[PDB]
């Protein structure tokens, strides 16, 4: 079709390997761009150990309050929230926002021993269905994104079914659901990559993810205004180990994927 040529055409333009997986609820219709083909997850990882907390909520109904500490030795790389609240606590509601809307590497490392390890995330995944989202390692090593390294990675079909379970289907319960919602919605990293590619009047919650190997991914929801939501997976990763990241990949792949629907 035209948006698969001309999403070829972006990737040729780009010098890297794009993943691309829509989602049209209205039709339950998919577009998919390599969406066979794995790609290191990054942050984006981070929504699956939230959700999977969010899971364990439903029988724990205080677990989201529960207080965890956090100490000089549990920061990591990159701490923006978490920094705030070293020799404190921060609760497991806080720690879910902190890793989804400023992608707190701390915060996600607390979500995942929460779930007995990078194993207890992945156990999630194949619990409401996802039999390609895998969860090898923790913060930070799990962004390396090497070159045929299957660690950490899923694909972009794999993650945009998951992600329309989590938030517009019923893998989880109603107020968990809606909780995961808030969050995306409220994402601060996101606003030079899908979002720079969709009219301003759309509400998007996403989660981006970055790393090694100029890795440049993005997942998002998208409510455009009186129409049936959308699921966007856009991942973008290059062959230097020292390439800069290139949102505007993924800002150009959902301008073309919004040109047609």
Aim: with cysteine.
């Amino acid at each position: 079709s035209a948006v698969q040529q001309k999403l070829a055409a972006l990737e040729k333009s780009s010098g890297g390997r794009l993943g691309v997986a829509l989602i049209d609820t209205a039709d339950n219709t998919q577009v998919l761009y390599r969406g066979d083909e794995r790609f290191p997850m990054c942050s984006t990882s981070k929504v699956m150990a939230a959700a999977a907390v969010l899971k364990q909520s439903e029988t724990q109904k205080q677990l989201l309050n529960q207080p965890v500490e956090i100490k000089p030795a549990d920061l990591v790389n990159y701490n923006p929230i978490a920094e705030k609240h070293v020799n404190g606590t921060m609760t497991l509601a806080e720690l879910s926002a902190a890793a989804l809307q400023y992608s707190d590497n701390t915060a996600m490392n607390k979500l995942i021993a929460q779930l007995g390890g990078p194993g207890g995330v992945t156990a999630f995944a194949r619990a409401i269905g996802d039999e390609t989202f895998r969860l090898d390692r923790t913060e930070p090593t799990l962004n390396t994104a090497i070159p045929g390294d299957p660690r950490d990675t899923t694909t972009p079909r794999a993650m945009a079914q998951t992600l329309r379970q989590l938030t517009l289907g019923h893998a989880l319960g109603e107020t968990q659901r809606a909780q995961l919602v808030t969050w995306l919605k409220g994402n601060t990293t996101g606003a030079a990559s899908i979002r720079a590619g969709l009219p301003t009047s759309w509400t998007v919650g996403d989660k981006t993810g970055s790393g090694d190997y100029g890795t440049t991914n993005d997942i998002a929801v998208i409510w455009p205004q009186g129409r049936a939501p959308l699921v966007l997976v856009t991942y973008f990763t290059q062959p230097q180990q020292n390439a800069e990241s290139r949102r505007d990949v993924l800002a150009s792949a959902a301008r073309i994927i919004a040109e047609g629907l």
